[PDB]
PDB file of C-alpha atoms in Angstrom:
ATOM      1  CA  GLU A   1     -10.422   5.668  14.328  1.00 55.10           C
ATOM      2  CA  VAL A   2      -9.878   8.626  11.469  1.00 53.21           C
ATOM      3  CA  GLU A   3      -6.196   8.373  12.233  1.00 54.32           C
ATOM      4  CA  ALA A   4      -5.960   4.716  11.815  1.00 55.18           C
ATOM      5  CA  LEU A   5      -8.219   4.970   8.238  1.00 55.36           C
ATOM      6  CA  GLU A   6      -5.554   7.750   7.291  1.00 52.54           C
ATOM      7  CA  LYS A   7      -2.690   5.402   7.379  1.00 54.53           C
ATOM      8  CA  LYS A   8      -4.713   2.534   5.661  1.00 56.72           C
ATOM      9  CA  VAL A   9      -5.842   4.819   3.063  1.00 55.04           C
ATOM     10  CA  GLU A  10      -2.186   6.093   2.407  1.00 58.74           C
ATOM     11  CA  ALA A  11      -0.841   2.753   2.152  1.00 57.64           C
ATOM     12  CA  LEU A  12      -3.674   1.942  -0.349  1.00 58.36           C
ATOM     13  CA  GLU A  13      -2.928   4.745  -2.289  1.00 62.90           C
ATOM     14  CA  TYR A  14       0.799   3.421  -2.728  1.00 62.63           C
ATOM     15  CA  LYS A  15      -0.173  -0.082  -3.418  1.00 63.28           C
ATOM     16  CA  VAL A  16      -2.795   0.856  -5.818  1.00 61.30           C
ATOM     17  CA  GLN A  17      -0.333   3.023  -7.879  1.00 59.29           C
ATOM     18  CA  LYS A  18       2.141   0.498  -8.001  1.00 59.60           C
ATOM     19  CA  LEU A  19      -0.471  -2.027  -9.257  1.00 60.37           C
ATOM     20  CA  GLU A  20      -1.658   0.423 -11.879  1.00 57.30           C
ATOM     21  CA  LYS A  21       2.329   0.937 -13.230  1.00 57.37           C
ATOM     22  CA  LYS A  22       2.721  -3.064 -13.088  1.00 54.09           C
ATOM     23  CA  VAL A  23      -0.636  -3.578 -14.997  1.00 55.19           C
ATOM     24  CA  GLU A  24       0.025  -0.970 -17.668  1.00 58.32           C
ATOM     25  CA  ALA A  25       3.519  -2.693 -18.284  1.00 60.07           C
ATOM     26  CA  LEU A  26       1.415  -6.007 -18.905  1.00 63.59           C
ATOM     27  CA  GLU A  27      -1.049  -4.288 -21.457  1.00 64.59           C
ATOM     28  CA  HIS A  28       1.488  -2.400 -23.221  1.00 63.37           C
ATOM     29  CA  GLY A  29       3.997  -4.998 -23.318  1.00 60.85           C
ATOM     30  CA  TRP A  30       6.700  -2.859 -22.120  1.00 62.75           C
ATOM     31  CA  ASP A  31      10.183  -4.390 -21.381  1.00 62.05           C
ATOM     32  CA  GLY A  32       9.918  -7.628 -23.034  1.00 60.68           C
ATOM     33  CA  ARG A  33       6.590  -8.620 -21.896  1.00 57.77           C
TER      34      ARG A  33
ATOM     35  CA  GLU B   1     -19.531   8.370   8.488  1.00 59.49           C
ATOM     36  CA  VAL B   2     -16.230   6.393  10.079  1.00 62.60           C
ATOM     37  CA  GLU B   3     -18.242   2.689  10.088  1.00 61.15           C
ATOM     38  CA  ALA B   4     -19.032   3.545   6.495  1.00 64.38           C
ATOM     39  CA  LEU B   5     -15.688   4.165   5.632  1.00 59.36           C
ATOM     40  CA  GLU B   6     -13.924   1.591   7.664  1.00 57.28           C
ATOM     41  CA  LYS B   7     -15.943  -1.333   5.958  1.00 54.89           C
ATOM     42  CA  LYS B   8     -15.186   0.162   2.426  1.00 52.48           C
ATOM     43  CA  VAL B   9     -11.396   0.369   3.271  1.00 49.95           C
ATOM     44  CA  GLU B  10     -11.314  -2.931   4.581  1.00 46.77           C
ATOM     45  CA  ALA B  11     -13.098  -4.225   1.769  1.00 44.50           C
ATOM     46  CA  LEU B  12     -10.405  -2.103  -0.800  1.00 45.32           C
ATOM     47  CA  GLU B  13      -7.631  -4.306   1.354  1.00 42.60           C
ATOM     48  CA  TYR B  14      -8.822  -7.455   0.456  1.00 41.29           C
ATOM     49  CA  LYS B  15      -9.404  -6.647  -3.240  1.00 39.79           C
ATOM     50  CA  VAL B  16      -5.888  -4.717  -3.170  1.00 40.31           C
ATOM     51  CA  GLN B  17      -4.360  -8.085  -1.638  1.00 39.87           C
ATOM     52  CA  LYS B  18      -6.049 -10.321  -4.103  1.00 39.12           C
ATOM     53  CA  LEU B  19      -5.124  -8.195  -7.242  1.00 38.05           C
ATOM     54  CA  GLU B  20      -1.351  -8.104  -5.689  1.00 36.67           C
ATOM     55  CA  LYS B  21      -1.075 -11.878  -5.659  1.00 34.90           C
ATOM     56  CA  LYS B  22      -2.790 -11.778  -9.490  1.00 37.49           C
ATOM     57  CA  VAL B  23      -0.430  -9.497 -10.734  1.00 38.84           C
ATOM     58  CA  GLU B  24       2.518 -11.252  -9.125  1.00 38.03           C
ATOM     59  CA  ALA B  25       1.649 -14.495 -10.852  1.00 42.42           C
ATOM     60  CA  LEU B  26       1.275 -12.674 -13.936  1.00 42.23           C
ATOM     61  CA  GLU B  27       4.876 -11.069 -13.603  1.00 39.70           C
ATOM     62  CA  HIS B  28       6.535 -13.894 -12.664  1.00 39.00           C
ATOM     63  CA  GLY B  29       5.004 -16.467 -14.851  1.00 42.68           C
ATOM     64  CA  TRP B  30       3.663 -18.427 -12.095  1.00 41.46           C
ATOM     65  CA  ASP B  31       1.493 -21.729 -13.146  1.00 40.59           C
ATOM     66  CA  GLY B  32       1.901 -21.467 -16.857  1.00 39.07           C
ATOM     67  CA  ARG B  33       1.238 -17.686 -17.813  1.00 42.00           C
TER      68      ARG B  33
ATOM     69  CA  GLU C   1     -10.983  14.850   7.794  1.00 45.92           C
ATOM     70  CA  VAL C   2     -13.779  12.572   6.769  1.00 47.16           C
ATOM     71  CA  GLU C   3     -14.622  14.127   3.825  1.00 44.74           C
ATOM     72  CA  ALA C   4     -10.851  13.943   2.415  1.00 46.99           C
ATOM     73  CA  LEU C   5     -10.834  10.231   3.156  1.00 51.49           C
ATOM     74  CA  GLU C   6     -14.235  10.064   1.469  1.00 54.84           C
ATOM     75  CA  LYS C   7     -13.066  11.338  -1.513  1.00 54.13           C
ATOM     76  CA  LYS C   8      -9.951   9.502  -1.266  1.00 54.90           C
ATOM     77  CA  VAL C   9     -11.726   6.121  -0.938  1.00 56.62           C
ATOM     78  CA  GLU C  10     -14.557   6.636  -3.927  1.00 62.12           C
ATOM     79  CA  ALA C  11     -11.285   7.415  -5.982  1.00 61.51           C
ATOM     80  CA  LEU C  12      -9.486   4.046  -4.856  1.00 59.24           C
ATOM     81  CA  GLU C  13     -12.710   2.281  -5.461  1.00 58.83           C
ATOM     82  CA  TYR C  14     -12.709   3.357  -9.132  1.00 56.51           C
ATOM     83  CA  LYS C  15      -9.202   2.946  -9.455  1.00 58.43           C
ATOM     84  CA  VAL C  16      -9.497  -0.697  -7.815  1.00 56.46           C
ATOM     85  CA  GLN C  17     -12.415  -1.905 -10.107  1.00 57.06           C
ATOM     86  CA  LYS C  18     -10.714  -0.893 -13.135  1.00 52.44           C
ATOM     87  CA  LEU C  19      -7.701  -2.821 -11.960  1.00 51.86           C
ATOM     88  CA  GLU C  20      -9.881  -5.613 -11.359  1.00 54.48           C
ATOM     89  CA  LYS C  21     -11.123  -5.382 -15.074  1.00 53.54           C
ATOM     90  CA  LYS C  22      -7.588  -5.128 -16.510  1.00 50.85           C
ATOM     91  CA  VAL C  23      -6.809  -8.161 -14.859  1.00 48.43           C
ATOM     92  CA  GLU C  24      -9.301 -10.367 -15.283  1.00 48.37           C
ATOM     93  CA  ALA C  25      -8.790  -9.743 -19.237  1.00 51.05           C
ATOM     94  CA  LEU C  26      -5.285 -10.582 -18.823  1.00 53.07           C
ATOM     95  CA  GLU C  27      -5.872 -13.762 -16.748  1.00 49.53           C
ATOM     96  CA  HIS C  28      -8.617 -14.916 -18.876  1.00 50.99           C
ATOM     97  CA  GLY C  29      -6.774 -13.801 -22.168  1.00 49.46           C
ATOM     98  CA  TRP C  30      -9.867 -11.648 -23.536  1.00 50.52           C
ATOM     99  CA  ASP C  31      -9.632  -9.952 -26.584  1.00 54.26           C
ATOM    100  CA  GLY C  32      -6.412 -11.151 -27.768  1.00 53.59           C
ATOM    101  CA  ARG C  33      -4.228 -11.174 -24.528  1.00 51.99           C
TER     102      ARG C  33
END
C-alpha cells in the first residue's frame, strides 16, 4: 500500500510542477501569452 | 494513517486531472479562450 | 515512510489549492485577466 502511494505521489509531484510552470507562464504572459 | 493518505491522494488525483484539462484549454485557446 | 508521504501530500494539497485559485481567476477573467 505504501509503495502504491509513493508512486502516485511522485507522479502527482511531477504533474503539479508542470502545472505550476504552465500557470506561471499564463499569469506572467510569457512568450506571447 | 494509510487510509487517510489514500483518500487525500485520490482527491488530489481528481483535482490535478481537472486542472490539467483546464490549463490545456487555456494554453490551446479552446472554445473561445 | 508514512511521515515522508504525509508531508509530501500536505505540500501537494497547498500547491493544488493555489493552482485552483489561479486557474479560476484566469478562467473567470478576474481582476483584468
